Amino acid sequence: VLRDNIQGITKPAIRRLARRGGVKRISGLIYEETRGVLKVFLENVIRDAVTYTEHAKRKTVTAMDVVYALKRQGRTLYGFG
Amino acid sequence: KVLRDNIQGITKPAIRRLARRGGVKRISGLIYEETRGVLKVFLENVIRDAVTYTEHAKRKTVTAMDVVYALKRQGRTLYGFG
Amino acid sequence: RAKACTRSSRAGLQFPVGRVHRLLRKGNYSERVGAGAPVYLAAVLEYLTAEILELAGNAARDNKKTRIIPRHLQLAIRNDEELNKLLGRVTIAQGGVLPNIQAVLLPK
Amino acid sequence: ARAKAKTRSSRAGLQFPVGRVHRLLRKGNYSERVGAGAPVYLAAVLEYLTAEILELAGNAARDNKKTRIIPRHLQLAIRNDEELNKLLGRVTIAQGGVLPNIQAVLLP
Amino acid sequence: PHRYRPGTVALREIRRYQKSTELLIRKLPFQRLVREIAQDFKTDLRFQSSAVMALQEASEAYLVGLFEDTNLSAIHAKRVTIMPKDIQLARRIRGER
Amino acid sequence: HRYRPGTVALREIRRYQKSTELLIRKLPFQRLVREIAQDFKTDLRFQSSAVMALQEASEAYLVGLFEDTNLSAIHAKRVTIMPKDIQLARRIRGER
Amino acid sequence: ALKRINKELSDLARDPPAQSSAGPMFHWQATIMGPNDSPYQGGVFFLTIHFPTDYPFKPPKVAFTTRIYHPNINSNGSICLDILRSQWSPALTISKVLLSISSLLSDPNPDDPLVPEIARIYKTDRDKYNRISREWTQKYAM
Amino acid sequence: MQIFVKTITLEVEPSDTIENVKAKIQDKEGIPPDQQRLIFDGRTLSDYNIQKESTLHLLRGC
Amino acid sequence: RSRKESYSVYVYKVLKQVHPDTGISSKAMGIMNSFVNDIFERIAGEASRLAHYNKRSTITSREIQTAVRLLLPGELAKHAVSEGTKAVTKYTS
Amino acid sequence: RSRKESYSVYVYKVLKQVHPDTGISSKAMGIMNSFVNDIFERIAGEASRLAHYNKRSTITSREIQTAVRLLLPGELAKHAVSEGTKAVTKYTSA
Amino acid sequence: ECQCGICMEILVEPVTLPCNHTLCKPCFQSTVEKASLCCPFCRRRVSSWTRYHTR
DNA sequence: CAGGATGTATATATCTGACACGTGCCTGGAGACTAGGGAGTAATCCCCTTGGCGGTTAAAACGCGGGGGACAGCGCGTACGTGCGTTTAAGCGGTGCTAGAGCTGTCTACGACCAATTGAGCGGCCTCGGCACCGGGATTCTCC
DNA sequence: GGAGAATCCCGGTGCCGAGGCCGCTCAATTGGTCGTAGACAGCTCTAGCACCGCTTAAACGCACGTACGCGCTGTCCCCCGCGTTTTAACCGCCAAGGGGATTACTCCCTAGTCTCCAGGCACGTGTCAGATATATACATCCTG
Ligand SMILES: [Zn+2]
Fold it and tell me: Phi/psi class of residue I12: alpha, beta or left (left: φ > 0; alpha: ψ in -120 to 50)?
């Protein structure tokens, strides 16, 4: 088992994401909130992905399962069949 | 040919009481045109689907189910009309 | 022949298992439909209706009234987090809005 | 030796497979029966949409002094065109990036 | 004489209109607007009273939601008066434009 | 010799808005994904394509959220995004 | 849940179930007498009891073991009663079940019977139902 | 012999009536004898020619 | 003379089960019918999508369980799945 | 040996008809296939809903016209309808 | 009154029902999903109360 | 803090019409049945996933300096809420007309279905060139 | 305006992913036939449209004055830019294997039809919860 993997999302990574988003200056408290928001989003997507996988009776999560989970949230993703 | 003055039919007090229901404390004077522009855009979007539903139905009048379908297809499902 | 017992009575439900099955086989959802699928669906629908109605009745009794109205339904739906999330994109006719005011606008 | 095999797309001067579209329609549980001209119309619409997207992507690529279409070019073409942007406002494209724009307030 | 300071009447109006469920727009001008809008897509169209009521309900609910969003945006702007900038921001964030 | 603050921020904005590379490190992202998935079914297994698709979707979502919060911060007459701006953007979009 | 079975049994010992009787611990034998002013009056009817390992949250498997002429009881003695199928509750005693059984014997239900022919006889010719019920009570219960 | 129910294994030899086997199943499991039928009362296991390890299959409850 | 069908009777029965001494407006019944129809359409569509994804052709309790888990959020889904399994158990028994 | 099917060949043909001297990446082809599948699913679902609403059982070109008008916005929808009508007319003549 | 109303055993982690009924944690967490989601004592519905007090 | 002006909730009265109730009937649910194909199960093959290892180094964390921007503050102008007096179409209600929705009854083009035929796309299997890369010259922006 | 640091571009190189060739089989086509969904005529009548008239509450317009939006200013702290140090991602390599995809098959579940009936639908009905009216208490604000 493992834990405290949310810190793998480094401050420079968050800064790069914000710069791609078009942010000039960033406050110091943005990082913890971004961590929380990303954790919530990943939980929501992975819940549906795992449900789709376990419905098909297999132990491997597939790109099609992830695509279906994203599609059911109105955020269809191309490039994975 | 119904005139274009009907957009003014949405009165300033009506917009103000809609804002009151929405929880607005006070309203700037410039809002009353932006709001009726937004309302007319939304109504155009909904009616454009309702009329084509009716045309596909080969009818001359617009039923309530056509409006319900048009609202449903925009992710705005409405309850209370079947 | 024999005494006729409804499938809802077999499952101890209230919703029409036969009507649900007919709708499933008439809605062009699949070529064939399993036996327990209408039962499960009717059970789920009955549970959801009961859950909504209990909250609506509690709202009405807190309002000192005896008939459930769309205002009560809207209050019950918007007060429960789960039901609000399930019906976040649903508009109720004659439902009104949830009464709340931002604390900033209050006098101080 | 009945007749020279001519595809319905060749009859209509199309490119997309009318037969494949028809098979997908009748295997998709969309309706009991499928009309004759429905696959032809659908193939024509799909061909037009693909042609428009490819034209926009090729123009974007030639504006980038490149000869191969890439997901970046596709994303630029989709985001630039208002019609395609509204059609695919909820669609994410892998390796697409963002449309380059900076608010005037941030500029010195 | 008697003169309420500004704001209290607005607060009581908010309390009143957040407790009622009636339509807040006039039926005849709303019908005239709907008929004017629909006359360009196709002429000589007819409507059901139920359809018009459904359109009015949907429009009022959408406007109330938009006003809630723009009020939140304006409060975020450290103000108490709504202005078209806030409405434009809400429309942009909700992806309607 | 030093640049005035913000110029390198603008240049890196230009650098990143033109490239389509992934901005999160694959190994810690995959560790986080597996850690999150531990709470639904144990000893799960993942496909590399599935993990990459999750990363693409997450990055696109975060970029959109950052665009919205930058817009809100600009609306608030300032250039520094603050957590209240993110909260406002998420609330308006209906995520909470 | 054995204590609950014994506590009810101890209470049942403290309060005998009138003309009816029951007792053995999952298998119990229940013996009841004919209700007064009934075609079954005088006859003694025996019943079976099977206790599942969910009492009092699940009704016991209870059926008739004496041949009877009643629309709501089949040839094997099965019972068509709400408190045994739907209206079961952990807040009632077996004596209440016996009283309801006696009432059903006195007042058969033709709407949802177990023997449609006997139900038709009961609904159409009440005297015929009473006669045949008394005859079967004399033949089997007596 | 052996008997399978399509479930209590095993049961009596091919010499008893179906009523006795149903009563034994009811006593051992709690399922009513009338629930549900015999698929493969007056007839016996020998009348139906039921051999060892035969596959047998077991109403209007309300 | 087309006989149209709704869920008003069953909704009334459920209302009596929950609150035995509470009424309901006629328009509220239409809202309840619309809600039931919407939920039915959602669940049926999700089950059909699951069946197509798994390359199957039959809708069983598995597909409906998966659809309910996907749709209903949090503790609400837990109770709903519990109710459905119990109903299937009684029906199968 | 699952013989999977896509639209790569037809997409390539259309690309060569539009720009005879332009290449396409492999990943871009997958994106085009996903886009075509998504649009096909949208149009088919809308046509099925229209057929169900009108209490019909046959999906014809008339339903597809209304589905296209519902989905595609404005000038794009007009051009798509014109192209589909022309193609159907030519097919019927043939 | 120190015993549960159903099991008649010692009240271990007593759970207070909204209808003033007292029952032990084993009996309570069994009757939550056991038979009818209702109160055996006075037929008081507890599903909403159970959901509220679970969190 | 206090009393008056002003809403505002509440008790009781009586109306009223909406809904919970009762009834004829009819069609859709239940039952018994056969047949056929969808899928549950085993076994099998192999392939992608997990796990590990070691050298590189690009990326991340620490830290120091400074400057610029968020923030509290202040003063001022103005515009919008609040009230009151003056129009005005909304609303009701009522009447009348009629076009189009809804239905039933015929009839036929046509699309599913089966038999028979064949060739276009999938897969493989190649060949080459578009582009990534590396060094260097020229251009540009930013800062003092 | 010059220094410097980054950015863009041109040239040579090599590769590997895009483009092209070859079965062959399965998915496409063609041809018949038949039940039927849909197209059309026809009749009915229900609901939409248009109108008139009287009521009046709602909309409109004006004055003001006050509370709020906005501009200016000091500060100041925190966030950006930089450098040095630390480390873990990563590419490469190998190995074990659990688990995914197919085949056979068989058998049990579900489609289909027939017959029967009863629960729900359309329709009366009366009564009862909600609304309006009006006189109360009760709470709120506001200017002193
Ligand atoms: Zn207990």
Answer: alpha
